[PDB]
């Protein structure tokens, strides 16, 4: 594991065997969907929407209680982003590393991590293009990445 490191940790999330759970949840699935929608319009990403839902509410896994996944619900309600969440966070991290390197030129460690992060971005962008989530010939330019993340 750790395609750009030497770690071999697992630290995963073991979701339950039950696919129709937790047998004590009383809120309607329509209430959950509108809860998700108001959170998306509040401006949260699907990952942090799920954790906020899982904590402040009893929803263990919204895919289980509802009929659709988080990102699927936002897309069907007209709230999906221009670039996917994980790709956006990767480009955000690359901009931070490049911004640091603009004034700390001699940080060859940050230069090494920038290449690792950027190669991670290009691998992910290749997947999104071959699945048509991104438009074709969509490119990470490293000069308009500041505008992509703002």
């Amino acid at each position: 594991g750790r395609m750009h490191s030497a770690g071999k940790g697992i630290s995963s999330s073991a979701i339950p065997y039950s696919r129709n759970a937790p047998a004590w949840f009383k809120l309607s699935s329509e209430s959950v969907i509108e809860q998700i929608v108001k959170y998306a319009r509040k401006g949260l990403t699907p990952s942090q929407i799920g954790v906020l839902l899982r904590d402040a509410h009893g929803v263990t896994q919204a895919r289980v209680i509802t009929g659709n996944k988080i990102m699927r619900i936002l897309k069907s309600n007209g709230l999906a982003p221009e670039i996917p969440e994980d790709l956006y966070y990767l480009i955000k991290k690359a901009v931070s590393v490049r911004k640091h390197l603009e004034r700390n030129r001699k940080d060859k460690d940050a230069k090494f991590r920038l290449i690792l992060i950027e190669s991670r971005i290009h691998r992910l962008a290749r997947y999104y293009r071959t699945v048509a989530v991104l438009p074709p010939n969509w490119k990470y330019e490293s000069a308009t990445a500041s505008a992509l993340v703002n």
């Binding site: 073991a14 004590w24 954790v51 899982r54 904590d55 402040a56």
Partner: protein
């Protein structure tokens, strides 16, 4: 050893094994019903909340995130499941 029952192991063994190395892996985290003294509202929280959940009325603190299980505030009551 050399002759075992991998199909019906002891719940003691399943208790001490890792969550992802049991016969069928599943979560060991649970949920809590929490009462803050300010109001009679009942609120569900995740044991590993990893966020500072707030009550509807006393919207300051209800549990404190930690590396593992969330540390509930000393000024509240909890109930499992």
């Amino acid at each position: 050893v050399l002759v075992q029952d991998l199909l019906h192991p002891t719940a003691a063994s399943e208790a001490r094994k890792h969550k992802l190395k049991t016969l069928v892996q599943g979560p060991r985290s649970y949920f809590l019903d929490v009462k803050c003294p300010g109001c009679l509202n009942i609120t569900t929280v995740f044991s590993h909340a990893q966020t500072a959940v707030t009550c509807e009325s006393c919207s300051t603190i209800l549990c404190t995130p930690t590396g593992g299980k969330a540390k509930l505030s000393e000024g509240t009551s909890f109930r499992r499941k």
